Amino acid sequence: ITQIEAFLNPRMGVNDETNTWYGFSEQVTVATARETDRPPKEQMPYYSCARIPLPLLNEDMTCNTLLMWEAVSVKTEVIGSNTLMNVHDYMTRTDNGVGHPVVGSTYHMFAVGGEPLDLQGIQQSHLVQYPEGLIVPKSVTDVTAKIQCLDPSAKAKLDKDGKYPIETWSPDPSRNENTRYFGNYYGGLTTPPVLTFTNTVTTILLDENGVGPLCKGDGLFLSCCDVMGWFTAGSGTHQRFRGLPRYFNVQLRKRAVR
Amino acid sequence: SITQIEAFLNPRMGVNDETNTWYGFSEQVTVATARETDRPPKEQMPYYSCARIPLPLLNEDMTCNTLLMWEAVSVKTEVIGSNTLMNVHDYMTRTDNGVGHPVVGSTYHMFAVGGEPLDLQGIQQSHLVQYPEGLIVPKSVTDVTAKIQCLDPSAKAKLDKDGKYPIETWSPDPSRNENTRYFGNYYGGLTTPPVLTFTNTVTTILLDENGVGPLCKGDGLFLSCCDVMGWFTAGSGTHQRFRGLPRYFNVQLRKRAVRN
Amino acid sequence: SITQIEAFLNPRMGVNDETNTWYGFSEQVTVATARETDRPPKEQMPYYSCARIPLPLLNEDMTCNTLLMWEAVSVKTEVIGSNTLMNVHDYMTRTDNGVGHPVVGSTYHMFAVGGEPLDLQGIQQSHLVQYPEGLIVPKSVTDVTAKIQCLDPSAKAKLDKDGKYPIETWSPDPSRNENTRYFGNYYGGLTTPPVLTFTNTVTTILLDENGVGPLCKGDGLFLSCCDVMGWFTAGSGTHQRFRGLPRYFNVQLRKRAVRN
Amino acid sequence: SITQIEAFLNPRMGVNDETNTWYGFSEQVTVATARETDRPPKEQMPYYSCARIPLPLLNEDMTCNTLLMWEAVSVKTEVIGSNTLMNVHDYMTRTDNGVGHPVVGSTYHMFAVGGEPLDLQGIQQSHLVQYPEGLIVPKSVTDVTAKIQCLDPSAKAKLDKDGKYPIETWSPDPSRNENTRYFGNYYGGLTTPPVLTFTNTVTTILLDENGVGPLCKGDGLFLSCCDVMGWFTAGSGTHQRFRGLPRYFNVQLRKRAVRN
Amino acid sequence: ITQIEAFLNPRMGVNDETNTWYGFSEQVTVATARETDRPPKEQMPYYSCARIPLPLLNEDMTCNTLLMWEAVSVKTEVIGSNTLMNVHDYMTRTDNGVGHPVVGSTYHMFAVGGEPLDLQGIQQSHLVQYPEGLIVPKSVTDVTAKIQCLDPSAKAKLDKDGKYPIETWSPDPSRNENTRYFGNYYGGLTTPPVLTFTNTVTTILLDENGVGPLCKGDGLFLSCCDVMGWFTAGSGTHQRFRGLPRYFNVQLRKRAVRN
Ligand SMILES: CC(=O)N[C@H]1[C@H]([C@H](O)[C@H](O)CO)O[C@@](O[C@@H]2[C@@H](O)[C@H](O)O[C@H](CO)[C@@H]2O)(C(=O)O)C[C@@H]1O
Ligand SMILES: CC(=O)N[C@H]1[C@H]([C@H](O)[C@H](O)CO)O[C@@](O[C@@H]2[C@@H](O)[C@H](O)O[C@H](CO)[C@@H]2O)(C(=O)O)C[C@@H]1O
Ligand SMILES: CC(=O)N[C@H]1[C@H]([C@H](O)[C@H](O)CO)O[C@@](O[C@@H]2[C@@H](O)[C@H](O)O[C@H](CO)[C@@H]2O)(C(=O)O)C[C@@H]1O
Ligand SMILES: CC(=O)N[C@H]1[C@H]([C@H](O)[C@H](O)CO)O[C@@](O)(C(=O)O)C[C@@H]1O
Ligand SMILES: CC(=O)N[C@H]1[C@H]([C@H](O)[C@H](O)CO)O[C@@](O)(C(=O)O)C[C@@H]1O
């Protein structure tokens, strides 16, 4: 059993660790028309991803029998729920009451994979104009009204950290044979966030046949996104997405393959 | 041994045409000004999705007293695109400089895997609704009285047309569907937040009490679903639209011998 | 040998007449102006549904010291018609150009399968209510005092008439019902969203801790339920109506020898 | 092997007199105008319910170094009367011509089965409350200081009087209760909807980790509970009353040999 | 099979048992600017922690084989949910209605370990100016915008009661090999609190290899925080954190180890 640890930082829009709003989005702006809907880069949450390099197993990749790393299980943890207990920051308040803590829509997902997470493109609006330096369904097909449902042409891989927006991309259930993904979504404008944390819980990654993800290229592929909802600064009614970092501890073993 | 079949079924929220700019939503919902004048346009209601997937022919010769049928053993299913509701920059209602108000309200989730069409039982919130011609509704199969507000045993149909059987008039019939497995949940309210989980690690077993999965008559696999996520509100108004999401099915099939 | 019995029980929400245009609803709920003049009309309250299903006669002679009884071993039950609550185009209250306000409020779900009528315990929110002629209420079996607001052990009855025992005055008696299995849940509030799951894949075992299911006295299967989904609000005003839904039962029975 | 004991415990919501017209409720709750003049009348607070059920004498001679004790091995418990909260026609607050506002607010549920009185730990929201004469409160057993707002280890008592130990000053003591099993849940809020499940099909095992149930000292079985459902608001005003419900217990016991 | 039991009092800001607001914070003040955000120490909740001394097991610590106390299981309980059923105190009310009970954000965590709990620094705002005598990320590292996500340098041990604020410190999932920790968080301004209590539930502390926390220096390390939400006195709209005490009953055995 080989243990691999990693923390993936949230990519909430302010993805630069020198910027004072790191781990939040920039203030979210809202379209004045369907056809003029143009969100800046910094105002949308992204999938976080990392390829962790694994020890080289085959001193010759020509042999018809090889060793590949198998992900057998994962302990994962969203850290920092405790930060949202801060209600003395410069936040909206009612009379002399506490600062209004982060609330709204929540999006939790992690994936452990032997290759990049397969993504399927889908959108709330076909008419959105995404900025430059983002991978969105437009990058791979003709975005029509079909993208508001299932357009089987809208396929991609999560290979760039902080560049694939959650709002255009779902884990593709029709692929991801070599990846396990898990997520949940809870909507609403002001819904309270919920989180549980413990170091006592292991997720088994073996499939129906006892085969974990197999790490192509001696690469272990971690993906996630942990939106806690919106923060509101005491400066106004403008809101920012707030995300938290995710810990991964993956257990691997060597598996012989043809 | 095990044959994998997969399919995506797209939502039928009333804008059922993939050329239309509001595909995957209803048209703006209108409300009756009287019980007796209640006439929903067909583009303003959500429908059951359904697809008959053709399977490989198993029997060269149908004279044979022993034949093979495809047996649905398990299904991995997945409502895709909960992530799209994290879009709050679209042209939506907002409070001051706050984010766009996301999709909220009543949720209706249902899926079925069968070896024939899903059996439906007619039931309505109002017996006085006038449905457009071209929809299959309780009127289509029996005389509609007040009885339809409860259980009218004569109001039986089969889900045999995609995007034409409205959810508001049809429930899966639990007194039939011997050769289908169905699963659903409903959460009401006007502004209830939507909830969804997704994973590719979860298999639902379709074998009945006797270890028999759905058996695919005519070498067809019958998939059906509806996935209403609630109501969208465009920043043009207070008019609301149903929002649905597509559903993946990956059904595990094996060959089952049957006496002919 | 497993014999199957299936039945639908229609809700008794107050409009218990299948010819009435508000069947499956209550009449408009009125509210007392004083604790001492609290007089609810029969049509304004939800009732327990119940039905005795006749079973095949088993014993040609009842003198015999060994007899067969039908034993209920399991049940598949389903509340039908959650899909009807996805109708928001009816003549209903609305906010601006938004959808009709769907059914919301207090929910009460219960089902029972027994070999005799459900045992009831009388209990009331107010001892001063004056119930109308035609209903079976604690006053029918005992002297009603303030004790009826807690547990009055005199307030005993059997659920032997469909749509005449108001839910508001009768609980399933946990001190009796040796020969019945009952199940239920309650969720209060004025505007709480209703919740429902449905499937044809879930069986409830009726065998007690001794391996014995309900034994059908007089070759009768006793089915009981109530399925209050909340209150409907017509677009004519702020007046509200209870809304209930029908329940399906599929009971698996076997013959069980008994000593007499 | 098994002896069955059954009992109902009525709620002690502050109107603890079965001849009072508000039995099963509190009197109208009053609120302090200062921390230092906070004086709740006894009828305005809910209490623990308790009862000792006598059990057959097993030991004719108490000098014997081997004796039998009754061991509680399991319990079926039920909160009765959630159905009564479906009454929305009583003289209750209402919005326009809507139904009466049903019971909502904070819920506190607890039950305990023990071979002696339940051990209580004193703890308070305010150390400055002045409790009326005739109640057992932390003041009865120790010096009440600000320590009582957290854990004051000197604030120890035994639930030995029905309707006299206010729930707001007393927790089940997890440092004692070796010879008791207790279970509870709390759900706060001013207007939270109440939730209840009921069934006669569920048994809770009372055996500890070493397979030992409560052992009935003095051949008594000690039942305790509290079942606050929230607040009732009469149509007379905005004054509220605690509303509680009775709890049924059915305890299974066996004889166990012990060493004196 | 040895039994340890302890009550840990909450450290909600009024950490002083002589103070009339023991078990609550002082009234919470809110920053008027990101850069002047200075929380007085009495207005934040802290981790509670204690070290329970255990019997000495080894005469000679030089030996290559020794006995350590092993934590196999714990019964834990938050006490005092019943106190929140008091709606007659001097509290906000609507008309002649009951006092508004404690509502808002809840934070529950407990930990049982063979050494102090490992903490990872993380903040909602890198710009907060923490008062004197608290241990906060800046106490151990260079605080920058990195502290708003995961800064690997922000590492500490929960070694002082009522001095590590919950809003700066998460249990570190990358350490705590010799600790089990459990927690849950539920946000919102007015969310109803929820609590279950029973004496019938045991949590197993053995890891995947069947080993519990092993008590270094014959000390058992208990950590917790139990914030129930905010109280609002009838004097105004000013709020106080409200916390509750936590009971621990830890079962220990002797385990032989290779030194
Ligand atoms: C549950 C109850 O007591 N209902 C009353 C009802 C309501 O109080 C009222 O409709 C408000 O919702 O009042 C009823 O009519 C009454 C007459 O019988 C009486 O002569 O005059 C009363 C005037 O206060 C009152 O209108 C009704 O609507 O049916 C009687 C019913 O029992
Ligand atoms: C919990 C508490 O202290 N209750 C008080 C109560 C309330 O403060 C009041 O009803 C508002 O809800 O006040 C009581 O009556 C008091 C008199 O005894 C006193 O002489 O004058 C007071 C006026 O400032 C007040 O009316 C009451 O209603 O019973 C006493 C109770 O302890
Ligand atoms: C968390 C924080 O920054 N708290 C401030 C506090 C609050 O901003 C204020 O009470 C609103 O809730 O302000 C404190 O006092 C301040 C003075 O130090 C200053 O001279 O003037 C300030 C306003 O301009 C304010 O009065 C306080 O109330 O304790 C200080 C605290 O850090
Ligand atoms: C999603 C979207 O279309 N955003 C646009 C916003 C908003 O319309 C307004 O800020 C109202 O929130 O306007 C801009 O001028 C801006 O501030 O950058 C352009 C930006 O593209
Ligand atoms: C469900 C229903 O009856 N809708 C009817 C609507 C609504 O009453 C109004 O638009 C108010 O919402 O009125 C129409 O003229 C319309 O707009 O198409 C006819 C339609 O039959």
Residue numbers in the entry:
A (entry chain CCC): 41 to 298
B (entry chain BBB), C (entry chain AAA), D (entry chain EEE): 40 to 299
E (entry chain DDD): 41 to 299
Q: What wording appears in the published article?
A:
Polyomaviruses are small double-stranded DNA (dsDNA) viruses with a circular genome of approximately 5,000 bp. These sialylated glycan structures interact with loop regions at the outer margin of the major capsid protein VP1, at the apical surface of the polyomavirus capsid, as revealed by X-ray crystallography and cryoelectron microscopy.
The Neu5Ac N-acetyl group inserts into a shallow cavity, forming a hydrogen bond between its amide group and residue T69. Additional, nonpolar interactions involve the methyl group and residues P79 and H128 of the counterclockwise (ccw) VP1 monomer. Finally, the N-acetyl carbonyl oxygen forms direct and water-mediated hydrogen bonds with the backbone amide groups of R78 and T72, respectively. On the other side of the BC2 loop, the Neu5Ac C-4 hydroxyl group interacts with the protein backbone. The Neu5Ac carboxylate group is not involved in any direct interactions with VP1, only forming a water-mediated hydrogen bond with the side chain of residue Q83. Cα atoms of the BC2 loop (residues 67 to 82) from the liganded HPyV12 VP1 structure superpose with the respective residues of the native structure with an RMSD of 0.3 Å (55), indicating that the Neu5Ac docks into a preformed binding pocket within the BC2 loop and that no conformational changes occur upon ligand binding. Well-defined electron density was observed for the Neu5Ac ring in all 10 VP1 binding sites of the asymmetric unit, and in some sites the Gal ring could also be unambiguously built into the electron density. The interactions used by HPyV12 to engage terminal Neu5Ac are strikingly similar to those used by TSPyV.
